[model samples]
Target: MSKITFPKDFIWGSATAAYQIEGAYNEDGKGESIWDRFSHTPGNIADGHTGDVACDHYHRYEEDIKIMKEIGIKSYRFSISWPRIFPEGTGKLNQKGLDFYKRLTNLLLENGIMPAITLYHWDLPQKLQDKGGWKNRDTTDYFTEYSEVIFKNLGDIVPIWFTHNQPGVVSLLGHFLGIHAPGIKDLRTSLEVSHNLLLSHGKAVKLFREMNIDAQIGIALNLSYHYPASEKAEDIEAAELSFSLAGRWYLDPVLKGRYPENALKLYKKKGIELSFPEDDLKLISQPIDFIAFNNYSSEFIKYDPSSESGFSPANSILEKFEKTDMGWIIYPEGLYDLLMLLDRDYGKPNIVISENGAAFKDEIGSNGKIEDTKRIQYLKDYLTQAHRAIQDGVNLKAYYLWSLLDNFEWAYGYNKRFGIVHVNFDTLERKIKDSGYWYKEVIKNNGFLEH
Candidate 1:
């Protein structure tokens, strides 16, 4: 078997979002966000549950940090809510909000945890969405202002940072399906939103460089899988197109200083035109740092003969493996394949697994431990694939489990648990599950145990 070991400083940690964990929504001078509004609306979220009191990590962040320390985690990934920092999305930096982050950052530092900060994580302050969120070009300036605010206040504390979180979520689900913040179902509008989001990413990265911030800056991508479901060349092209549209749309723009020409041409054929001032590309192609990625279940695509050329419209996503409670297929080999693709296609910048974990319907067993066999197998096999990628020479730096505690899973709500440590959402109490102990062993040895 190939050796599976991360680098000496390979960051082992957990990730959580501001809205999903820090549930002091509207507390201490906080403003309302689109998510806060959407999740609260009737029939929008499951069980009508909102992140109003998610994980309560805001007040109990110290306790959370204690868990990280105990687990021997050297790093942690968390997002700063745009609304909490700037109530109206611009002007008047909220000191109280800033103070909370400062306290949290201090706690992390005290406990020897490196904070990798992601500026935005889908919680667009409602006021901004009112003024045309990512669809409006002017919001680019607002994002730059917001980025500066975050860096000015929290920049001193954390040196490793990412500009935005899951640009794809905002572009795809929110813009296309009308399933997220500023929910709208206009295809043309979705195209514009993607452009504007890229512009903001560039703007934010540019600000970091201009200020001479002593930190590593990059973008987080929720990249998708692209596998030909059949032997047909059309199927292969369709899969490649989808992957390009999803991965390269944001990745190419930020890393290579350009967007995919084919996608742009296709959008143009659909009568979608991108308009903006000059030098936007220069602002976007800012220098420095690694890529942060969120990897989950992947898809396998097949061409649909009834669809347009290259099967651009409809394709298949092969689910040929065991699935988690979330119905996410367990295919660890996809991780290795995806990393290899990244290395070949994008020059293999230092990569961090910003998010990786599965949701399982876990129950406290007779031993009082959450024994999630499927979750355990999923993680193990996935790590094995990661090991293969490392052996192939991918500059992968770290892996941060999707979560440390089972909190809100967004639209799905608390029904889905991705945490290794099972959390009683009712009491906000955390218990290290069997998988947690399993992971601790892997981390403790800096690798996995032989089966």
Candidate 2:
């Protein structure tokens, strides 16, 4: 018997980003994106490989759509490549680019799949990056223009729209950490970019309302649940810092209408005082239709007195926990805890699991099957917790696995694979791993059966 069961209306789906899957980087009138530039820079990507031909989804999306149907997915979440639409960010529209998405949406609707479109997934047009990118306020206005374009084109068909996928990642990992695309190593730029990204989201949401597009728009934030590794006061404070900086800094401004005061003061202590223009928060705090987050792991961190960031991730000294190929601690209960935290903090909004899945080392067997039982177990564990969240009145409505196909993994490039369906980069062939089969049954039953 299943430990918990979801409601009949619960949505089962999977997610993928354009740069990560839809390779055809320069085809179909798609202009250069910051990713194209960053991945091409020597030493920037793993194995010196780019997404120039990722899963080849741009040309083979029909094949993927078939897989999703086979998996019994009711909803499919994907992002629109900014460069693909505006080519150079905003001057002219790419007819072929727009047409491609139209075709994709029509196909999805025809096959009984609800389209949940993400407006951006870190694929900013290179032309915008060259002009100060998110650091400059003008880029925020350009985003509204781009948003309007997308809504005008595909708004009626896509019922659920994500404003952006993980602004913290777009700012911290991409800018301050210099690991993702448009990599830069500047604190001030990163903070500014963070604000602008939210500001743009607010403006887009405002436009989304004025235009009255038939869609529910929200943001997808990646959350890291944290706890102090030690009982010491400083360690506790460090965990608070990590939690706030990693998530609340972005979540508060949008949901609570203010940046986290403690995090801002901490930044000041680090010789970086940040502030935004008036009415920006007012726009950002506009009521959103739902709340979404990408949950994967939790962190037990300790304080570092001399650490520049004021905290450092520390391994748990408690009982051993399984970890993913990406070295992420696999604590399935973390998802339930995180969901409860969000509900408590933000008033029980409609919640969606935008992305949640684990990466594991996989190999094709002589029997022509990629077993991936570890990945299967990972999903079984986390999903049981997700069902528990719904049972506990968390208003959880949907779950979209991190990816549907194995594609590029950002700076780690193709090294980390996080998909249910295996992709052979060499031949662009798709294979359903054991996890995919497990997920299919889960969807068919609307919940997992006895293991």
Candidate 3:
């Protein structure tokens, strides 16, 4: 028997981003984005490939929509590129870019799908980044202006909105860790960016409410359920750091009106602080409708005292468990734990599994079918935990897997395939792997069909 079953009203959805799915980056008067600039630089991205023609979703969105309709997805959480809408970041609207989203939104509405839009999916306009990026408080106000424009336009039809996608990612992972765009390994700039981004998110929410528009606005956080590797104190400390870095980083500011103290102390030790008006906390505390979290896999945590606090790599929370092709451990209990922990820590916010999926190397048969049982098992393990989260009183109303079609995987580039639909990037042809079939059964049956 299934351990959990969602309420009849629970939403079923899928997720994708503009750069990862939408091509036509340079087409239709679109300005360069941070990602477009960063990915094209040498030694920055592995395989020297960029999302210049990602999934061709720009032109093949109808085909992608048909897949959603076939799978019976009730909702879709997606983002639009700011640079695409306003080529130079603020002025001169791009007619083609606006028309694309408008057409996509109308299609979804016509097909009875709830369209949840995320304003910034890390595709910041290159022009904005050129002006010191998120580290500058000026960027915060610029974001409000951008949101005001998009809200005024898209809010007329789209009522569900997310201000930012993993705001902490750009700050820490990109700035401190130096893996993503505007690569810099500095805590001062990263923390400043973190502060300004969250402040911008709250500011946008306040603006949306003041605009008297009808839309649910909030932030989407990508976090894992950090599990300590052992009973050792080092492991415990590492686990705590991982949890704070993910769950508490943004949540504390919004709910508690402060950032995590220890993290801030470490940043201050590194001389990191934000300077702005006294209304910063109030701006960051703008009321939010719900929280969205992306929990893909678990990692084992152990403190490495030798390295810097946030700069050092995060210890894998699942050291003892088996891992996926992507090197993430396949521990579904982490999913349930994350949901329950969010509920226990934060109030019962309308939570959504914003991104969840696994990567596996598949060998296609001569007949063209990609027999991917690893992905099938991956979903089974995950949805089982999703069921448990529901039974445990976690308000997980929707689960949008990290991907629907195989596209570029940031550093891994096209080397990794996490999608149910496999895309031959060369020909832009999409083939449904076995996992897609498995997923259809789950969506069709309203849950997993197997025992």
Candidate 4:
């Protein structure tokens, strides 16, 4: 066994999105979000589940904060629901909605935990959806207005901020795949949505800087490392294309001040043009303090001329690797490789692993204990790779576990659990699983001994 130690002041945290964890969909003058409408619709969510009362976090946030403290979380990353603050997406502020977050933030501070707020986490107000959502340029301004409200209210207290969480997921999954909120299945519309989301992020960053908030800010992208299925030239090219679409499509414009040339060419070849003002790129590349990426797995790509993007996932190669309950391959090496890629290709910017965890079939023993050895192993392996990356000079600063509790998993609803602390859906009782205790120990020691 070898001892592993993290750098001094390394942050250990946990993350949760409002829609996924904080239910009370329409309580306390909160406006309806696209997720509320989508999940309430018949057949839109699995197992006929909805976030109508997810974990009841709206009322249980104080208890949740206590649990976070018990787990030794140094930083807590959570998103603020836009609809909650601005019921109709812009006209009047909801004092009750804002007060709830203020209370939550104060409790976190009182407990000596840093609050990291994500301004947007896919729960756009349904009113905005009525006006074409992210596809319409006007929505970008609405986003900025919504952001300014939050910045003015909580910016000084919240030291870390993320403007948007996984815009690619918002674009590709919600708009193109039609599996998420504001579901619309159109590739061209998805591209437009992606562009607008980036535009909104840039505007929010500019506003934050102009306001002179003494805090760090960044955007979170769900990123993965792509590998070629084979050594063949076409397969290698396909892997590069995959990275270009997934990574560069967001990273380039934010960090490099331009979109990936290969991605643009591929889209043009497919007769789908992404039109944006010439100056939008400059706004979208505003200097930021850091980049946060959520990575749970990677992909293997193979050339497929007939596919829409001239490449498709090579799942056969992933069969040998153990899969999580979410069907994601357990590939800790991918985390190391992804960090290295960001360091080498993105000018070695400061980075944070915003979300990283696995879902497993957890069970409560008759003794009322959750062993959850699989989840513990998953964290240990990934963290080992993360430490290796930091030791090798990658500027990774923090690691926020995917969730603090198991709640609404979007289309999957409550079926998947990615939390270190298991939540009993029926009682909303939070149980600190073995993994939670393991994480607490890691935080306490700043590392662990690898066996």
Displacement of residue 343 (Cα, Å) in model 2 is: 0.8
Best by TM-score: 4
Runs in model 2 deviating more than 4 A are 1-3, 230-234, 316-319
Model 2 alpha-carbon miss at residue 16, Å: 0.3
Write model 2 residue lDDT over 1-451, tens digit each, in one string.
Answer: 5445689899999999999999999898899999999999999998998999999999999999999999889999999998988988989899899888889999999999999999989999999998999988999999999999989989888999999999999899898999888988899999999999999999999999999998899999988678788899998999888888888888898999998887988899989987677899999988999988898988888988887888887855423887799887788888888888888889999999999999999999999799999998889889988888888889898999878999899988899999999999999999998889889988888886655
- Residue 18, candidate 2: C-alpha displacement in angstroms: 0.4
Q: What lDDT score is found at residue 403 in candidate 1?
A: 82
Error of 4 at 81 (Å): 0.7
* Order of the predicted models by TM-score, top scorer first: 4, 2, 1, 3
lDDT of 3 at 408: 77
Winner on TM-score (1 vs 4): 4
Residue lDDT tens for model 4, 1-451: 8999999989999999999989889898999999999998999999999998888999899889989989989999999999889999989999999998989999999999999999999999999899989988999999999899889989999999999999999998899999998989998999989999999999999999999999999999989999999999999999998998886699999998898988888999989767778899999999999999999999999999988788998978988899999998999999999999999998899999899999999999998889999999999999999999999999999999988999899999999999988888888898988889999999999999988
Candidate 2 vs candidate 4: the TM-score winner is 4
* Predicted candidate 1 versus true structure: per-residue lDDT over 1-451, tens digit per residue: 5446666766787888899888989898788998998888877678877899988988888888887877777788898888878899998888888888888888898888899888888888888888888877888898889888878877867968988888888888888988776678888888788878878888888788788888888888897567777777777877777777787788887778777887777677667767655687767777759887899978777666665534543323443467788876777888999888878877878887889999888888888888888888888888888878988999888898988888888787888998877777789898887888888877888886554
Question: How good is model 3 by TM-score?
Answer: 0.93
Clashes of each: 0, 0, 7, 0
Model 4 has how many clashing residue pairs? 0
Instruction: Please give, for residues 223-342, the per-residue lDDT of candidate 3 as tens digits.
Output: 887767678877777777766766688888887677777666665665665564668877787778888877777656666777777333344433557778988778878788878878
Per-model TM against the reference: 0.95, 0.97, 0.93, 0.98
